[PDB]
Amino acid sequence: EECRVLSIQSHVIRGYVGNRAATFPLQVLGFEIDAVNSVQFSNHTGYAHWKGQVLNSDELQELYEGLRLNNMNKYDYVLTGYTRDKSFLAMVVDIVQELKQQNPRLVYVCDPVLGDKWDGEGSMYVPEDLLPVYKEKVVPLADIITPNQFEAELLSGRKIHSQEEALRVMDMLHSMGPDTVVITSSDLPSPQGSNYLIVLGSQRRRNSVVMERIRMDIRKVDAVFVGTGALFAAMLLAWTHKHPNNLKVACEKTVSTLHHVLQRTIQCAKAQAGEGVRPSPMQLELRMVQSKRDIEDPEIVVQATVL
Amino acid sequence: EECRVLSIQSHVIRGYVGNRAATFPLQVLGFEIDAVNSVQFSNHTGYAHWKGQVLNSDELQELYEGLRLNNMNKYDYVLTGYTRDKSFLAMVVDIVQELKQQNPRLVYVCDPVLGDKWDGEGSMYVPEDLLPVYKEKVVPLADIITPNQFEAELLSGRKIHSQEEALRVMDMLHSMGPDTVVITSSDLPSPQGSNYLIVLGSQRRRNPAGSVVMERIRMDIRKVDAVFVGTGALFAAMLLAWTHKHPNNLKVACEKTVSTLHHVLQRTIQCAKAQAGEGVRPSPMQLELRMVQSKRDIEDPEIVVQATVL
Ligand SMILES: Nc1ncnc2c1ncn2[C@@H]1O[C@H](COP(=O)(O)OP(=O)(O)OP(=O)(O)O)[C@@H](O)[C@H]1O
Ligand SMILES: Nc1ncnc2c1ncn2[C@@H]1O[C@H](COP(=O)(O)OP(=O)(O)OP(=O)(O)O)[C@@H](O)[C@H]1O
Ligand SMILES: Cc1ncc(COP(=O)(O)O)c(C=O)c1O
Ligand SMILES: Cc1ncc(CO)c(C=O)c1O
Ligand SMILES: Cc1ncc(CO)c(C=O)c1O
Ligand SMILES: [Mg+2]
Ligand SMILES: [Mg+2]
Ligand code: NA
Ligand code: NA
Secondary structure (H helix, E strand, O other): OOOEEEEEEEEEOOOOOHHHHHHHHHHHOOOEEEEEEEEEEOOOOOOOOOOEEEOOHHHHHHHHHHHHHOOOOOOOEEEEOOOOOHHHHHHHHHHHHHHHHHOOOOEEEEOOOOEEEEOOEEEEOOOOOHHHHHHHHHOOOOOEEOOOHHHHHHHHOOOOOOHHHHHHHHHHHHHHOOOEEEEOOOOOOEOOEOOEEEEEEEEEEEOOEEEEEEEEEEEOOOOOOOOHHHHHHHHHHHHHHHOOOOHHHHHHHHHHHHHHHHHHHHHHHHHHOOOOOOOOOOOOOOOOHHHHHHHHOOOOOOOOEEO | OOOEEEEEEEEEOOOOOHHHHHHHHHHHOOOEEEEEEEEEEOOOOOOOOOOEEEOOHHHHHHHHHHHHHOOOOOOOEEEEOOOOOHHHHHHHHHHHHHHHHHOOOOEEEEOOOOEEEEOOEEEEOOOHHHHHHHHHHHHHHOOEEOOOHHHHHHHHOOOOOOHHHHHHHHHHHHHHOOOEEEEOOOOOOEOOEOOEEEEEEEEEEEOOOOOEEEEEEEEEEEOOOOOOOOHHHHHHHHHHHHHHHOOOOHHHHHHHHHHHHHHHHHHHHHHHHHHHOOOOOOOOOOOOOOOHHHHHHHHOOOOOOOOEEO
């Protein structure tokens, strides 16, 4: 038929983050995705410099209005990510509500960007007054959430130390509304070694209500990447759509695609930088286009273990 | 590569025109295309309704300011299309003029959007005070322009009544600046019927030996009973791409471009008729180019139309 995705995320002229990381991948996979750029910057804030303007509530509403007037406010998925403005996010919520009112089956894939951890623990890189809005108004509306450990901790108030406390916290989120919760990265240890970050997933469905929990030990890459979480949420949406009731497979293809892309990025980043020289943010920009075939049909280089 | 392209055009949420019609295709063909969205509307202005905001001179300058501070102002191509502000257009010209100081080998592909013609009568749909800026500043800086007939007559000053006047206009356009001039559409006579639009190509280049030569082509394309939007931008985009792959063969660049456009519209029209259903003209929404569904056609266009050598 036709799968339309409304994607309200950031836009950078140069590089791949927000809608730049989310759009191409989703188009290559056959999704009619529409990109509302919550901001337009020359590049991500991971660089020394950056310039750009921002889209305010009034404008997002103005834009949604045009879609409504034309009777084009019927979607199958809504995708959202990083937001700094409290009022902006409220407006986003009002939009999703009406989009779900228009189509009762619409899926809201929310990546609750609040902050991350470095070494021991983290710090939020978003106004704190936004946390309440997420717990109360955003997550309840969301059907799929993809937070990292630190964000899953902030949304639940419960700190995570082990695979079991993580499932407990994921279980809490589920009761908040999300039928699919995926922790995209964590400090949890792996039997594979110290060079492995851990992904955990949890999906609630009926077949008769039944759960499906999966685990994944992904090898770390010696560098900091931007736009990877957005690409994760974006590809999760895609493969979950193509393989419903199979979180295992959907996650294996998602993480695998991330693998290939980063594998190619780090390589070009090394050859482009000096051997023995830490690549710069610019050299570490996801080699998105060069990864078209991996995104289309990613070679599964990772098996998720059922919990 | 990577082959870098700066595309400063319009963006819309729903549908494909401007940056939305050019980005996916070029990304699919491996081009690292950075998009500077000049405006952000809900949809194109062909729908009953449309709301949105627009980018202005300063913001475009600021966005450019960031790219420069990070030493990211080195591109292989610059792609521009429908511009609405004499102010914005001047800022674009200043930017393209610096990207060329930064990299002399840079290629500016400019679609001089001015207007078009319907049933014979042509008129503009952009501020008239834009024509001087294009003539004196934009075209001189261009390397590949893709104006339709009307814009070709406006840029040169000579109405095009036959294939002869077209070619004379192209020579004129060449003298103005760009070595590649493609008249994306014209209602010239075709030895195949009335329902055929004509495309004309002309490229100037010096070969290995060093002799400056010119290759000219002509394509007679059958008309689809419908009015689409984004096709001109898609044409300029693919031209940028195919001339890149086949630098010294304008006949192949064009054959592929026009053929890609064919497969897209062919799939778009039949998928629009089913949507509007038997009898009813397809609405502007049902006629939105079926871009993501034509991925395979963009990557490797099956050539359905061979150009005529002039
Ligand atoms: N350094 C890395 N090494 C290996 N994989 C990585 C690395 N960084 C990111 N990834 C991949 O990207 C995915 C998302 O991780 P990241 O830590 O980038 O997102 P998050 O921080 O989990 O998301 P967000 O910051 O939006 O809340 C990881 O699951 C992994 O597949
Ligand atoms: N109705 C149509 N039937 C057949 N082909 C079309 C039709 N409309 C557009 N095309 C194709 O798209 C190309 C661009 O034509 P269009 O008339 O859409 O652009 P232009 O008007 O030439 O460009 P611009 O609007 O920027 O001045 C044509 O050369 C042709 O290949
Ligand atoms: C006023 C106006 N400008 C520009 C366009 C864009 O056309 P193109 O993609 O062929 O340049 C349209 C399409 O309907 C239009 O109505
Ligand atoms: C504008 C903008 N949007 C989103 C992100 C998160 O990747 C960043 C990270 O630096 C950013 O700068
Ligand atoms: C905002 C906006 N920008 C560019 C174009 C050119 O197709 C249109 C056509 O309708 C538009 O609406
Ligand atoms: Mg992280
Ligand atoms: Mg036209
Ligand atoms: Na995440
Ligand atoms: Na044209």
